[PDB]
Amino acid sequence: QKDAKSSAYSSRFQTPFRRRREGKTDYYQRKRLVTQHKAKYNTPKYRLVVRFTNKDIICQIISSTITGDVVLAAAYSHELPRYGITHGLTNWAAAYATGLLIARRTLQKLGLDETYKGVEEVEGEYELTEAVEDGPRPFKVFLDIGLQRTTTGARVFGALKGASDGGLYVPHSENRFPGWDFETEEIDPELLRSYIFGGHVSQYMEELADDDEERFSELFKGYLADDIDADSLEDIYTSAHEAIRADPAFKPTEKKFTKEQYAAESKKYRQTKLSKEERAARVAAKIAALAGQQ
Amino acid sequence: DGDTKDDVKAPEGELGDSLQTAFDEGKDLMVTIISAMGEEAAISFKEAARTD
C-alpha cells in the first residue's frame, strides 16, 4: 500500500558508497585526515585510530594506500590480563593503559624505544614529547576518533594521553582532559592523575560500601570474588605500567585449532545459494500446483 | 522604537492648524514626515484610533 516506491525513484536513486550506508565512516573527516601535502610525495600519514565497543577497546596505527589501508601495530583491551588487569576493560584508565601499550609496541618495533623514553613519573601535567637535540625527531601521528562525540573528559582522550606519555608525539591542547577548569582556563593535575589511576572508581567504591550492600554486590561482583580492595586499585595499574614498558612485543594467541577446521565447520553450517535449474523447477512446480487447480 | 525628533517644529500649514485643533481631544494622532535633502517638515495627517 503506502509502503511502495516507484520505479523512477528507484532508478534515479543515489546510494551512499558503502560505509556511509553502514554509518561507520565520516568521509568529510577522512578527507582532512588522509590528505598528504603533495610536495611530500610518498611520505604516508599515520593515524591513531581509537574505537570504543562494548567490553573492548581498539587502538591501531593506520596509513592509507589506493588498494586499501595498511596497519603498523594494534593494541586491544582484552590482552591486559597478560599485564595484570582483569576488570574494567573499558574504563578511562584502561584506555590510558592501552594507549601506553600501543605506544611502546610501535616504538619497540620501529627501533625508537631506547630514545624518547617518554614520561615515567606521571603527574597529570600537560607536556608534549619534545624533540631531542640533533636526534631522530620523534614519531608523529594523529587521532582518528571516527563518529565518536568529542567532549571534555571523554575516554578517547585517555588513549591520547597514554600515547603521549608512551613517547609518541601527538599534537593536542589540554582543554578537553578531565579536570579542565572551565570558568578559568587551567588544568588540575591531581584530578587528572587520579583518573589515570582509576581515582573516580576507587573513590566510588567507598560510597556504595557505606550506603547500599546489594548494589555493592551485583556490580563490582568480580572485585569481591577475587579480593581486590579500593585502595589496592592504584597499585595494580602501577605494576601494570612497568610490565608494558618491560615487554610490549604482542605475544599472539595459539588458536588451539586451524584455519581449515574453522572454515570447514562454517562452510558446512551456512546456507548456500540455489541454482538456476532448481529455481526453474521450483517455479514450474509452483505453476503445476497453485495454478494447476491444487 | 524611539523618543527622538525635537525637529519639524509643527508646520504653520492650515492642515496642521486643523491637526492642532483636533489634537487636544486625542484619538491617536498619525503624522507623516518628508525629509528630502535633510530639510524636513510634516506634510500629512491621519488617524488610527483602535488601541485594541
Binding site: 578527507k31 610536495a39 610525495y41 | -
Partner: protein, 159 residues
C-alpha cells in the same frame, strides 16, 4: 548586450554526471604526481576553488610545480599564427594521470627486455612496431560448410 564571463557556455560541460554527485573518492588525493608527468585536465564542478578555465577542458600538459594542494601545469595554446605556453595552477580534483604514458613506458622496459635477451644470442631483436600487414595466403575448406546461396528480398510494406 553580449556576455562573455569566465564560465560562459559551461552549462553542460560542468554538470557533474548522472548518479555520480556528492563527494570525490579519496583515490584522487592518494595519487602522487612527479615533475615531468604528462596529465589531462577535466574540471570537477563540485570543487569551485582552483578550477581550470573552460578552454582547457579536455587538454593535456606537463607538470612543472608541486605545492601543498595544487599542481603547476604547462599548456600549449594556439593564438594567432603561433603557440604560446600558458602556466596553470590546478587542484588535484581536476587532475588524473594520462595512462598513455603508463602504457608507453611498459613498451620501453619490454623492448629493454627483448633487446638484452636477443643480444645474448644475436638474432636481430627487431624492436620497431609495424602497421597491420596485408594478410598472407590461406586455404578454406568446405567440409560440413557447403556454401549457402543468397538472393535479394522483394519489397513488403511491413506496417
Amino acid at each position: 548586450g553580449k556576455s562573455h564571463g569566465y564560465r560562459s557556455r559551461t552549462r553542460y560541460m560542468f554538470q557533474r554526471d548522472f548518479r555520480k554527485h556528492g563527494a570525490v573518492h579519496l583515490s584522487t588525493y592518494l595519487k602522487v604526481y612527479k615533475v615531468g608527468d604528462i596529465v589531462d585536465i577535466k574540471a570537477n564542478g563540485s570543487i569551485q576553488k582552483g578550477m581550470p578555465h573552460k578552454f582547457y577542458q579536455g587538454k593535456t600538459g606537463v607538470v612543472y610545480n608541486v605545492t601543498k594542494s595544487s599542481v603547476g601545469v604547462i599548456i600549449n595554446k594556439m593564438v594567432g599564427n603561433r603557440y604560446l605556453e600558458k602556466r596553470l595552477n590546478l587542484r588535484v580534483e581536476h587532475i588524473k594521470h594520462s595512462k598513455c604514458r603508463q602504457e608507453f613506458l611498459e613498451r620501453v622496459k619490454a623492448n629493454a627486455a627483448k633487446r638484452a635477451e636477443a643480444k645474448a644470442q644475436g638474432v636481430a631483436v627487431q624492436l620497431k612496431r609495424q602497421p597491420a600487414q596485408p594478410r598472407e595466403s590461406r586455404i578454406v575448406s568446405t567440409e560440413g560448410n557447403v556454401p549457402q546461396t543468397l538472393a535479394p528480398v522483394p519489397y513488403e510494406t511491413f506496417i
